[PDB]
């Protein structure tokens, strides 16, 4: 129950695996049947969202760091304020999602401590 937890992506089912051996560490979701795969950079994970156990609502959200200070221009020639990254995953076992939320926290805090 570490660096891997059967997670649902885009309403689809699959396993979510995390690898801290790569820099920046990333998370890869692999369908159950192997029809869909997803990859996410954990190093950006600025906030971890998880549904409480008491809440029948099963879900897990990942928040990626931003950089509005960059100030990107739009097609209209006007500056815009970029938005922060946010992923949405669904789990069936509070334990599995509990591991992901716990493991992910270890990664953020890992980079947070450095800075």
């Amino acid at each position: 129950p570490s660096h891997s937890g059967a997670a649902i992506f885009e309403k689809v089912s699959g396993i979510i695996a995390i690898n801290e051996d790569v820099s920046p560490a990333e998370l890869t979701w692999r369908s159950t049947d192997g029809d869909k795969v997803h990859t996410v950079v954990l190093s950006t994970i600025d906030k971890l969202q998880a549904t409480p156990a008491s809440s029948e609502k099963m879900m897990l959200r990942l928040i990626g760091k931003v950089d509005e200070s960059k100030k990107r221009k739009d097609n209209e020639g006007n500056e815009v304020v970029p938005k922060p990254q946010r992923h949405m995953f669904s789990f069936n076992n509070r334990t599995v999602m509990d591991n992901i939320k716990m493991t992910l926290q270890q990664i953020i805090s890992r980079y947070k401590d450095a800075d």
């Binding site: 549904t51 409480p52 809440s55 029948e56 879900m59 949405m88």
Partner: peptide
């Protein structure tokens, strides 16, 4: 329909 909708899932009700 909107992001706020999914956010409610975390708020739920006692």
């Amino acid at each position: 329909l909107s992001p706020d909708d999914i956010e409610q899932w975390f708020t739920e009700d006692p």
